[PDB]
Amino acid sequence: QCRVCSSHTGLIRKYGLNICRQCFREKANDIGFNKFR
Amino acid sequence: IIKIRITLTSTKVKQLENVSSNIVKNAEQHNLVKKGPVRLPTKVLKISTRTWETYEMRIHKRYIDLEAPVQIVKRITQITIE
Amino acid sequence: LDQEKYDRILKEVPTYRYVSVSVLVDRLKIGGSLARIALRHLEKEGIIKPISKHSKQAIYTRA
Amino acid sequence: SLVVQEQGSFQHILRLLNTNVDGNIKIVYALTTIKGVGRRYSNLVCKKADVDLHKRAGELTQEELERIVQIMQNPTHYKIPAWFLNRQNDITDGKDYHTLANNV
Amino acid sequence: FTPVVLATPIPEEVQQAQTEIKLFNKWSFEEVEVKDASLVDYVQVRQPIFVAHTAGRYANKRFRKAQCPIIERLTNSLMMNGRNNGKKLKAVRIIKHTLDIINVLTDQNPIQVVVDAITNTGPREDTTRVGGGGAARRQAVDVSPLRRVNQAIALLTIGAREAAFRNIKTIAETLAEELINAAKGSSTSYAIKKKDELERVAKSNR
Amino acid sequence: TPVTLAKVIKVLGRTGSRGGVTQVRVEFLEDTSRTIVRNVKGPVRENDILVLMESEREARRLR
Amino acid sequence: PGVSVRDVAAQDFINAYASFLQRQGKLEVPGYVDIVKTSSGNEMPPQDAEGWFYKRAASVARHIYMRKQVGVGKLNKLYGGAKSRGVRPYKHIDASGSINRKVLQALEKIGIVEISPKGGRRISENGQRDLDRIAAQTLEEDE
Amino acid sequence: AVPSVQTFGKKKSATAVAHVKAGKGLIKVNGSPITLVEPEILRFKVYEPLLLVGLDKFSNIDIRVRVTGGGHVSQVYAIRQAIAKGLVAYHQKYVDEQSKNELKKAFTSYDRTLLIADSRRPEPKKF
RNA sequence: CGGAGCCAGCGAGUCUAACCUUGGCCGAGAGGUCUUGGUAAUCUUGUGAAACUCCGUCGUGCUGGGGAUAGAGCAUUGUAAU
After folding, report:
1. How far apart are CA H70 and CA H13, in angstroms?
2. C-beta of residue A3 within 8 angstroms of C-beta of residue A18
3. Per-residue burial over G6-32, b = 16 or more CB atoms within 10 Å of its CB, e = otherwise
4. Is the CB of residue G108 less than 8 Å away from at least one CB of chain H?
5. Which domains does chain E have, with CATH numbers?
6. Neighbours of C26 (CB within 10 A)
7. Would you kindly state where each structural domain of chain B is located, as residue ranges?
8. Mind telling me where the Glycyl lysine isopeptide (Lys-Gly) (interchain with G-Cter in ubiquitin) cross-link is (chain D)?
9. What's the CA gap between C29 and E108, in Å, rounded?
10. CB E153 within 8 A of CB E159
11. Least crowded by CB within 10 Å, which of C24, G46, H47, H56?
């Protein structure tokens, strides 16, 4: 269940951070998993 | 005389080596007995993201043993905050 | 039916230059299970000579 | 092993519990032929009857057939407990039944 | 043969078998008879591998595959079936049993039986399916001797896998029967017959 | 059976519809004076040895 | 040049030591040996119906002499079988703990295995002596 | 101190570290004899770095092998490569250079895997 | 099928909670009991995985291949398992 911005479509439900794959790639440059290979 | 182990972790190698080398220089310039910077394996935390792609993260770890009184340990722990 | 299956083993094995697991069932008298019992029995007697032994196939030689 | 040879004396097809049994397979897999009896059931019955199960069903005396039938109508008296039987904890009687072949 | 006794005893059978110049447990690679001159350069096994089980990377170059040991290459094409993918040790023991059988079936040189079955079951010429203008005829091409080795090993493994399936007779006995009936042309094996079929289609279609 | 022994001397390229067959110039092994043009299915490098059956057959081109 | 378990083959050691335990008979052997298969990942009980328990104990004692200590779950992991689930593929299934407990109580009652304060079944020095002696006798079978 | 050479030998994440000291002529792999390798088929493969040179090269040395990782075939190739490497390293560092060249020539002419590490790794699966 | 041998690596793990669990006893098992270790290259973990190796049972017979379907009970998570 999306507890951030009501965005259930594509939750990343792993580890309870629970961001949708749209907004996960919005906030991808705040955590640190970025493009290496 | 307290024996304290400092376990340092970082994502980038240059600042972590700088912090470790500053610990070595300052604990060497006033005669503290110590173990050298033990360099743990860099753990590679990865996520397979939707063919498929891979997101990576390198995490580097050192630890340094020190034997020092309370004043020197507190001043070292306060100043080395970066 | 004991004396008209068993001794044909004792005629055929010295005839055949090569005696193994399934070149001894082929005589169409016996099953494939008791054939290996007859193999070990001829090992003990001496008409069968061991070449190599595996749990699924065992190579022998006449005497 | 030792080739133990028998001058006839074996029957081709036996009949037990009103059902034909082929007297050429192992006794486990010859008593598996009848209904209500599988592999491990005939195996444990003939181990309680101490039957040599590497012997075929043609080399089996009818006294051991009587022992097997006695374990059929008495499974729970011969140290084969309730987990091993067909109809455990019934509703009609509250007992444990092993439903046999032609009695279904 | 001047034994050297160690504290960990390397046993007497192994010291006798590999101190004396026999290049297997019972066999030798010094006795290898190749008939065809084209098959001299593509069968070559002269290095004594006492198990005939190697982690070969022979499949990167087309010429390197010819330097795969043909005992090992036959062992590799034994590992063809879907139940057997990734089972080379099984086929090595199959080869060891088979060489034992070819010993006991009065062929003192079973490796020469293998090489002669390679030679006598290779279709020299075959047909390809040319365009031909609609009604596609088949034209006799003269297949390469490396492909003749490939083709003979493929036909032998296919015939042995056909014969050993759905019978009591083992893979080693069927494969030994095929190698003995195919080491000298007898038309009771598989690859002799199919070699003859491919060559008669080639001769009919040149 | 006439077993023609042959020598690859000159490769001509890759032909066939599928691009699989090879035109090969052949020095005949028993008699040097014969130079044949043959069609080979399979991998062939220079100075290889072939086993033909007819030295006299020559095919112009393929499709 | 010590004659010990480390020099003999695996199955030969298990056969010999199980034969010595059968001819001795001085262990704790239960009554559900003819009833109970060694693991839930099996269809049939073991074929050595009067003597698979001694084979089990020989495997256990050999597995204990070679290492520091064992448990019950470790020997459940060791025996583990690829179990068919009908239409589903095979999966790893550990064995029963009761066979492990009764084997270790049978070999601890005779004074061969013993509980070590790391919570583990280790080989006793009398058990070390006995297994090395019967391994020496297994080597003397080969002369 | 007993003169010993410590030398690795690797095969497919299977590392067998070998300790070739001056001993009785004793060979152990994981505290188990070289007579007893866990596959029966690959057994003579472990004998391939042994009989390719000879057996009087071994009476002077007690040989240790301790293994981590791998499979069944991988550990066999690891231990035979480690035996060859420890043997030629003993005959390099303590024994003269020429005998080391003879042992390395005997190993190289038959199987270069026994002296040179392998490369057939599983690739990264190309995302 | 019945025994034996027992070979890896990527991960992942609990706080203001019940995560990963070692071990010991009970139970045919499912599982249960009692604890203990690990917030982690430390404990689980050497994850003793499976395929594999060997030896015995089977003997080509919809067979001892198959396991779909169905009956009976027993346990586990979940308020509630039809």
Report:
1. 5
2. yes
3. bbbeeeebbebbbbbbbeeeebebeee
4. no
5. 1-206 (1.10.455.10)
6. 14
7. 1-82
8. 35, 48, 79, 95
9. 31
10. no
11. H56
Strands E126-129 and E138-141: antiparallel
- Quickly give D28 CA vs I51 C1' distance in Å: 31
Per DSSP, helices labelled H in chain E are 12-19, 40-43, 70-78, 88-104, 110-120, 145-164, 171-183, 191-204
Beta carbons of D101 and D31 less than 8 angstroms apart = no
User: Which positions in chain E touch F51 (Cβ < 8 Å)?
Assistant: 36, 38, 122, 124, 142, 145, 148
CATH of domain B1-82: 3.30.70.600
The whole-angstrom separation of Cα E117 and Cα G57 is: 51
- Protein-covered nucleotides on strand I (Cβ within 7 A): 1-13, 21-32, 41, 45-46, 48-60, 63-64, 66-69, 71-74
Do E190 and E163 form a contact (C-beta atoms < 8 A)? yes
N-terminal to C-terminal alpha carbon distance within chain B: 26
Cβ <8 Å between C1 and D1 = no
Give me the amino acid identity at F55: S
Instruction: Kindly provide the b/e burial profile for residues E50-77, where b requires at least 16 CB atoms within 10 angstroms of the residue's own CB.
Output: bbbbbeeebeeeeeebbbbbbbbbbbbb
From the list D1, D6, D7, which residue is nearest C40 (CB)?
A: D1
CA proximity to E169, closest of D98, G108, G8, C26: C26
Closest nucleotide to E168, Cα to C1': I60
Q: In sequence order, which residues have a C-beta less than 8 Å from that of residue B51 and are 6 or more positions away? A: H127
Alpha carbon distances (Å) from D61 to B53, D65, E88? 71, 7, 48
In the structure encoding, which two tokens stand for residue G51, read together?
């003597």
Neighbours of chain B (3+ CB pairs under 8 A): A, H
| Lookup result for tokens 């590999």 | E18
- Chain D residues with CB under 8 Å of C6 CB are 3, 5
Q: Cα–Cα distance between E22 and E35 in angstroms, integer? A: 23
Chains H and G touch (3+ CB pairs under 8 A): yes
| Sign, Cα dihedral of H32, H33, H36, H38 | positive
User: CB neighbours of E88 closer than 8 A, spacing ≥ 6?
Assistant: E53, E75, E76, E79
The residues near H53 (Cβ < 8 Å, ≥ 6 apart) are H87, H102, H103, H106, H107
Solving technique: cryo-EM
CA-to-C1' span, E69 to I24 (A): 57
**D15 SS3 class:** strand
F1-63, CATH topology level: OB fold (Dihydrolipoamide Acetyltransferase, E2P) (2.40.50)
Answer whether CATH 1.10.8.50 is correct for domain D13-78: yes
Domains within chain A, CATH numbers bracketed: 1-37 (4.10.830.10)
Alpha carbon distance F4, F26 (integer Å): 11
Quick one: B35 exposed, middle or buried, by C-beta within 10 A (0-12, 13-18, 19+)?
Answer: exposed
How many Cα atoms occupy the beta-carbon half-sphere of D19 within 13 Å?
16
How far from F60 is each of D89, F16, F22, CA to CA, in Å?
A: 88, 12, 12
What residues does F28 pair with on adjacent strands?
F6
Q: How many domains does chain C have?
A: 1
Query: Is E172's Cβ below 8 Å from some Cβ in C?
Result: yes
